[PDB]
Design goal:
Chain A: This is SnoaL-like domain-containing protein. Chain A: Residues 8-114 form the SnoaL-like domain. Chain A: It holds the Pfam family SnoaL_2. The PDB classes it as unknown function. 2 copies of one chain form a homodimer. The first copy, chain A, is an alpha+beta fold. Chain A has one domain: Nuclear Transport Factor 2, Chain: A. In chain A, 30% of the residues lie in helices and 46% in strands. Chain A has helices spanning 4-16, 20-23, 48-62, 121-127, and strands at 27-35, 43-45, 63-76, 79-90, 96-108, 111-119. Chain A has a 6-stranded mixed sheet. In chain A, β3 and β4 (79-90) form a beta hairpin. The relative contact order of chain A is 0.20. Chain A binds chain B through residues 36-38, 72, 74-77, 79, 81, 83, 99-102, 104, 116, 118-125, and chain B through 37-39, 73, 75-78, 80, 82, 84, 100-103, 105, 117, 119-126.
């Protein structure tokens, strides 16, 4: 049986494959998925459907080549912390960015129940300035 | 000596909250790499306790009224430790306040803190700095 760490790693693998079905496979209906306040997709999403539509779809619509690259994955038992880099080109302005990000995850009884994003919202915002 | 990385980082946070810089820096390694996020006003990688005090904490005290970190969670990943909480403060030049989230990723080796990295809502901090 998978540890929380493996469950989260599986999510990141599915993200590398651009596979939203696999990305959401272990998301519990109790999920609270928080995009950072200053991030364009800011908010707390409470179903896999809301996450796909209001976060991943929106990113695909508004950015070219929006990418996350995982650098580290820290095992805190039921909590797992991913660290990496985002990059992308904002379609309206044609401006790119790259910045750091950390994600804090929690798993409960084999399902992901919590996600929170911590990223350089200023650097992302700069790409979105005319 | 038998103190875990988690405890060492908890000790740091306690010292920082009560503004005891000697205790704040007591376990900082000679080989420290302390990274303030690129979009944060104190952005950069600092490589000694002296640098960190002068170019991070001193500057925060000079440029902000009541700059505060409130620890909400502390996650024990062994040699790595992740703090999560909230920043708040009032930028002295504009009189504007902010509050936002932050995560800190720490690494301890042989009883000393060797890496710190900050991940915070740099846009919200920046908004407070706008005339």
């Amino acid at each position: 049986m998978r540890t929380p760490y493996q469950i989260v790693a599986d999510h990141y693998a599915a993200s590398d494959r651009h596979d939203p079905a696999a990305m959401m496979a272990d998301i519990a209906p109790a999920i609270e998925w928080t995009e950072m306040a200053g991030f364009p997709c800011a908010g707390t999403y409470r179903s896999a459907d809301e996450i796909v539509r209001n976060v991943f779809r929106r990113l695909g619509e508004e950015w070219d080549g929006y990418t996350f690259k995982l650098d580290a994955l820290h095992d805190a038992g039921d909590t797992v912390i991913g660290v990496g880099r985002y990059s992308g080109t904002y379609r309206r302005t044609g401006k790119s960015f790259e910045c750091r990000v950390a994600h804090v995850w929690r798993v409960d009884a084999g399902k992901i129940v919590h996600f929170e994003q911590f990223t350089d919202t200023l650097l992302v915002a700069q790409a979105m300035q005319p």
